[PDB]
């Protein structure tokens, strides 16, 4: 039993009670550490920099989700307060080795981790970085110098700011460099899928937890706080709209059958590549009111492709049951569909209290924050691995600059798409009209199987 100073002098000395810290029945799966359910900010900071053992999971979780219950400037103050330990012989030499030195090292680990993985707090508050550099400068002694130097190297790096050969790029009617002829039917359907998988893979990888924690993509400053997520969602939306537009603007039935068939071939390749974002871009285009109603077009579609579309659609049925099952079964590289994560993070934050009350005292609900960090961690596990596919700068640029809406607002474009659907395939009993062909080039697909070894 070790003697710690009075809570009147050192706030983190106060003993544990139901009024300041509570736990879950389970223990850390691989570490045997108890799981904190809720506690006061002091008790959470005490356990972040605990003397008996290091708690990397709790540190990793905390620094991701603390901004709801504590400001960066307030966290720094708390960890500086924790480091500056007063004393309360045998007891005084033991306390120094078993309490002060371990706690001081744990505060420096927090600092190091914060700076390494959440430098945005410092980019957005230069005085926060001022106080952090100052504190680090005051740190002295052997054992600390090693960490103080490593932290100083990270700060300055943050201020400064791998496989075998990939497959051969595929070409169909459009030739390399002839960007003016690039379209859905002229580019090779394998390369449309690959180049879109490459854009969508980079977009997915760029989303950071700072854009998700606190459900900030749904708030008034979402354009400021969640820019990479929003670009990602907008590419996906642009691609769905382009697929719908390609379909309904192809008024000739035989050419429109060629268009739906080519989109299904692209979907097949997205399924091969595990680009589930791309799979849903296609599924969403097909379930849209302008596309879903085109029964004369679907009548002429080969059964192989119908079945391909049926399976892709079924990944979404029953609250994404099969999608979830399929994502767990595959291994990277893949491009997950982000929408599920966004709904689960939102509903976790909105469906659980920020605070629990025990014996009339407010405890920060940390388990709510852990649950969010589990989802942000799940998103990060698929951001590590890249695709072994070559970029084609012209095809890339063609998809980056797609603008099916043009200068029209959503409603105006959405109605244009639907009124086009009604024009090309009128509501029964109206007879099916015939429309002239618009494609000079041949409609036969080259297939989804590569041409060269």
């Amino acid at each position: 039993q070790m003697r710690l100073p009075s809570a009147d002098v050192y706030r983190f000395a106060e003993p544990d009670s139901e009024e300041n810290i509570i736990f879950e029945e389970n223990m850390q799966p691989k570490a045997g550490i108890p799981i904190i359910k809720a506690g006061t900010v002091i008790k959470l900071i005490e356990r972040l920099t605990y003397h008996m053992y290091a708690d990397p999971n709790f540190v990793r979780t905390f620094l991701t989700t603390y901004r709801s219950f504590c400001k960066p400037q307030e966290l720094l103050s708390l960890i500086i307060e924790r480091f500056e330990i007063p004393e309360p012989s045998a007891e005084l030499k033991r306390f120094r080795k078993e309490y002060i030195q371990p706690v001081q090292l744990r505060v420096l680990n927090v600092c190091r981790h914060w700076v390494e993985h959440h430098f945005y707090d410092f980019e957005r508050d230069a005085y926060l970085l001022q106080r952090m550099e100052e504190f680090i400068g005051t740190v002295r002694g052997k054992a600390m110098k090693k960490w103080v130097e490593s932290i100083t190297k990270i700060i300055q790096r943050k201020k400064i700011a791998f496989q075998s050969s990939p497959p051969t790029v595929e070409w169909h009617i459009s030739r390399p460099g002839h960007i003016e002829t690039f379209d859905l039917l002229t580019l090779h359907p394998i390369e449309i899928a690959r180049q879109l998988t490459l854009l969508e893979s980079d977009l997915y990888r760029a989303v950071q937890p700072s854009e998700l924690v606190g459900s900030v993509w749904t708030k008034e400053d979402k354009e400021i706080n969640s820019p990479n997520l929003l670009k990602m969602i907008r590419h996906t939306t642009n691609l769905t709209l382009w697929f719908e537009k390609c379909i309904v603007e192809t008024e000739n039935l035989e050419e429109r059958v060629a268009v739906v068939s080519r989109i299904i071939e692209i979907l097949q390749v997205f399924q091969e590549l595990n680009n589930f974002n791309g799979v849903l871009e296609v599924v969403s285009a097909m379930n849209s009111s302008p596309v879903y109603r085109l029964d004369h077009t679907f009548e002429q579609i080969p059964s192989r492709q119908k079945k391909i579309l049926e399976e892709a659609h079924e990944l979404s049925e029953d609250h994404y049951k099969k999608y979830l099952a399929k994502l767990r079964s595959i291994n990277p590289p893949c491009v997950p569909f982000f929408g599920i994560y966004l709904t689960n993070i939102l509903k976790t934050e909105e469906g659980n209290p920020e605070v629990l009350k025990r014996h009339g005292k407010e405890l920060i609900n940390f388990s709510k924050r852990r649950k969010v960090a589990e989802i942000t961690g799940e998103i990060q596990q698929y951001q590590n691995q890249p695709y072994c596919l070559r970029v084609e700068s012209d095809i890339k640029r063609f998809f980056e600059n797609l603008n099916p809406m043009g200068n029209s607002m959503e409603k105006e474009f959405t109605d244009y798409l639907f009124n086009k659907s009604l024009e090309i395939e009128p509501r029964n009993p109206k007879p099916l009209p015939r429309f002239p062909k618009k494609y000079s080039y041949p409609l036969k697909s080259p297939g989804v199987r590569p041409s060269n070894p």
């Binding site: 459900s215 993509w217 749904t218 708030k219 008034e220 929003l230 969602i233 907008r234 996906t236 939306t237 769905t240 709209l241 719908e244 849903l280 599924v283 969403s284 285009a285 379930n287 849209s288 009111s289 879903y292 109603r293 979404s316 049925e317 609250h319 929408g339 966004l342 709904t343 689960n344 993070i345 939102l346 509903k347 976790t348 909105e350 469906g351 659980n352 209290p353 649950k371 959503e410 409603k411 639907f418």
Partner: protein, 167 residues
């Protein structure tokens, strides 16, 4: 085989729409919600002494995926068109949600309900009379709910099941 009602929540984002379904499913006196499990969106209820299962789709958070609304709406028989009583833009947006639902279902008579959600203690900008009037012009019920007290949540959902049953 008991009857299963496939319900869809549609409404503006950023205004606490998720509270409606969360509060429904949350066994009152339990505030430990987990959206990742099956029981989080399914609930066995007894409406007018006829037991049924309610499957609720709430895509709260995916509003930027504007081209996925048709995919999602297409899965439902009934719809709760939700707006916040402190946000006039979320109220003004109902006319288009209804227009899309009608267009997705190829019907002018879709089992549908209008829900006015009191998501916080910010000021009311949408008077009940405006909403009752809007709901009347469309020919659908109007239910007001509280996100804190759980008042009106059962009524909103049970009224929709009745609209489907009486269709």
């Amino acid at each position: 085989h008991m009857t299963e009602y496939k319900l869809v929540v549609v409404g503006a984002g950023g205004v606490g729409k998720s509270a409606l379904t969360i509060q429904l499913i949350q066994n009152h006196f339990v505030d430990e919600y987990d959206p990742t499990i099956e029981d989080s969106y399914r609930k066995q209820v007894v409406i007018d002494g006829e037991t049924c299962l309610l499957d609720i789709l709430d895509t709260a958070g995916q509003e930027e995926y504007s081209a996925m609304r048709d995919q999602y709406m297409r899965t439902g028989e009934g719809f709760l068109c939700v707006f916040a009583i402190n946000n006039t833009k979320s109220f003004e947006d109902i006319h288009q949600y209804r227009e899309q639902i009608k267009r997705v279902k190829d019907s002018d008579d879709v089992p549908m309900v209008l829900v006015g959600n009191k998501c916080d203690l910010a000021a009311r900008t949408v008077e009940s009379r405006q909403a009752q009037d809007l709901a009347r012009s469309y020919g659908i019920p109007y239910i007001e709910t509280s996100a804190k007290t759980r008042q009106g949540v059962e009524d909103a959902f049970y009224t929709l099941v009745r609209e489907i049953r009486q269709h």
